[PDB]
Amino acid sequence: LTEENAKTFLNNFNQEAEDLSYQSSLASWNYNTNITEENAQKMSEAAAKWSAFYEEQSKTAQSFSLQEIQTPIIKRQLQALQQSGSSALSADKNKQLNTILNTMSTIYSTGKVCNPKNPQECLLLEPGLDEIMATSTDYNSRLWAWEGWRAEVGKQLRPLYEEYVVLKNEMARANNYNDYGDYWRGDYEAEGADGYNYNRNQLIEDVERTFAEIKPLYEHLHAYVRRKLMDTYPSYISPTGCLPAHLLGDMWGRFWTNLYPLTVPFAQKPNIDVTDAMMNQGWDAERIFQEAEKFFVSVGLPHMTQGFWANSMLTEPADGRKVVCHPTAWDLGHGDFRIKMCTKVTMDNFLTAHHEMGHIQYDMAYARQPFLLRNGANEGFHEAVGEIMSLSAATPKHLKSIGLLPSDFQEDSETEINFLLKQALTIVGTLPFTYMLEKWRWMVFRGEIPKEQWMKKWWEMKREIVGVVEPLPHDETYCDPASLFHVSNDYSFIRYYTRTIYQFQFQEALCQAAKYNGSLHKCDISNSTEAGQKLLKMLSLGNSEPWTKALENVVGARNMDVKPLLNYFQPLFDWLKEQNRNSF
Amino acid sequence: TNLCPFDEVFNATRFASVYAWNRKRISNCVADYSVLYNLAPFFTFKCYGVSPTKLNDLCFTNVYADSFVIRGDEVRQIAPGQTGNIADYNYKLPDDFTGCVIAWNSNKLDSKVSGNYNYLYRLFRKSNLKPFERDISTEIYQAGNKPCNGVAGFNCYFPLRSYSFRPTYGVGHQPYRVVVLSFELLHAPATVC
Ligand SMILES: *[C@@H]1O[C@H](CO)[C@@H](O[C@@H]2O[C@H](CO)[C@@H](O)[C@H](O)[C@H]2NC(C)=O)[C@H](O)[C@H]1NC(C)=O
Ligand SMILES: *[C@@H]1O[C@H](CO)[C@@H](O)[C@H](O)[C@H]1NC(C)=O
Structure with missing residues (x-):
């Protein structure tokens, strides 16, 4: 009933949800510090209570109407309560929904990776020793330790996700949306006044200018790493072929624990201690x-x-x-x-x-x-x-x-350049990967056709975009976006993309506010x-x-402004520019 | 010399809920305000209306010492003529308030493990509470047109919610035992000194 009922309902929801969320978080903390499966049981029951209460309040939120009445941030709060996700709908339709989430998380641990049928050097899945036993710059160890990992994961993931995405997009029939891909990017909708209205398709129009016109600048850097690889050992880049992507050393894109020492040709100045x-x-x-x-x-x-x-x-x-x-x-x-x-x-x-x-x-x-x-x-x-x-x-x-x-x-002089090279290589190269992964995700969320003809076109586009391809193809056995922590549970990827641009913009603004002379770093x-x-x-x-x-x-x-990111390196760029004059 | 009950009203084992705060009438007693601030340096005796020095030689009439337990920010809400959620529906002070407040940080006394729900406040009153009124009533609050008939739910809210005090909340939502002194001047012989 107008804002008079909305404010009271919102206050009640805030008061109850605060206590319930605190209890859920306390149970989760107790589980994460004292895992005994009893803390797991109590965390599960607390999360079930929290989910049930939130679903009830969200159903009340849809019961409310939000046409034009709510002018203040009450509108935003009710919209946040109104975003219910995968819920509601008829009982017969949503009964099978509970049979998907339980088995969604069990598919990751089904893959065991060690020496095939060999007791020697076989160990289970643990993050502690993987970071030290997986990163190896070798021409032979990267073949079956990687192809087997990629293949034995998505053995039947695609033939299930094919209908999973269809049934999940069918949920969009009753949430005033159009596509599950647009579901993620629609969270940015925000209007403040007349003439500042936010279009639903703002992303699909403002991304060409921020990425496509400056793509060659982030491509010369990819040429710089090509020349370094050849010097270490020959036959790393075929004159007619393309460099293998499975032997790069790490598909996580966090750090290079082996190539960092072999980066500066001189290797004479001391490193940090x-x-x-x-x-x-x-x-x-x-x-x-x-x-x-x-x-x-x-x-x-x-x-x-x-x-x-x-x-x-x-x-x-x-x-x-x-x-x-x-x-x-x-x-x-x-x-x-x-x-x-x-x-x-x-x-x-x-x-x-x-x-x-x-x-x-x-x-x-x-x-x-x-x-x-x-x-x-x-x-x-x-x-x-x-x-x-x-x-x-x-x-x-x-x-x-x-x-x-x-x-x-x-x-x-060179020490600060060496320090900035690692930070400008660990995250800057991640933006093209995140961009291509997110665009691929957006295009495959449509689900307009199975892969019987798009297979050649997708790989041709991938080859003509970046120029990296596996030496040999594979049958219907593998799936690329499955072996990663933040894709296993169906998370987003723009979070890791826009973070870099936003952090560099904020850093530029804060250093402008610092009013300090000297250098820009x-x-x-x-x-x-x-x-x-x-x-x-x-x-x-x-x-x-x-x-x-x-x-x-x-x-x-x-x-988004990439100009602060570029100006973070513009005053000190001749060092890289003078080493890129040997190409046409 | 008859020492005033500021011992058995301060050192009480348990205080009263905010929606039903206990108003203690005390008279014919000598008020030794000096002994009040002798427990840790973390009092919040920010005194309004009268001078910070209580003028122990100045005699008052009966003072209304009523105590309750609230959160940290609600201590700031308790003020002579300030709005909020607890100074509008639970405890309102007049604009001409004479006297002032004393708020502790009582985290080792009534912060029970796993939470205690013995402290209840009044939310959703729908009408500003006149100063010095209790309104201890358990009647489900109605906002919508539908007449509630003893069953809560949508548009029918129970107006007595719970603090659920427990440790680890922090400098914020922790039990701050609050006792305020209402010094009144209503003719009569003056006894409180
Ligand atoms: C971790 O949680 C357990 C129970 O969830 C706490 O109690 C221990 O485990 C069982 C309880 O069923 C009993 O043997 C004892 O109550 C506890 N055992 C031991 C060896 O302490 C346990 O106290 C919690 N641990 C911590 C550090 O909080
Ligand atoms: C309350 O108890 C404490 C604890 O010993 C004592 O020091 C104090 O004198 C008592 N009376 C008060 C604070 O009025």
């Missing part, structure tokens, strides 16, 4: 997080709560309390703000602790927003904000005043109170205000 200065001085898990908090409060962000240190579990367990090793920043309802990272002290643990503390700082900004808007303004903002501080805390200028590195080390968010408030005025907004207007109000930007 952070762990040597952390082990002796007494830097541990209890203190790295304190240093990150000191860095965050030196900008203006508030200190962590007293309970944050009280219940955090920053160290290994004591009595058989196995934990899923993954750095996750936890909210826990009423501002508990726990953090889970069971790791020792290394080079990357410090920086990922800074990134997780950035996640927690972003979380400690919208605790005043309504429960339905206590999220990031966009899918890509929440990770990008943490990654901004993660990358900003890695500069030697930051690790020279604290005391981690000696003060007698004057900055060098020595600028740091630390000891900049004005930059601190300029970041906080965006963090403490949530979903109450549209992300477009949020980005506008800070510095002024209609959409």
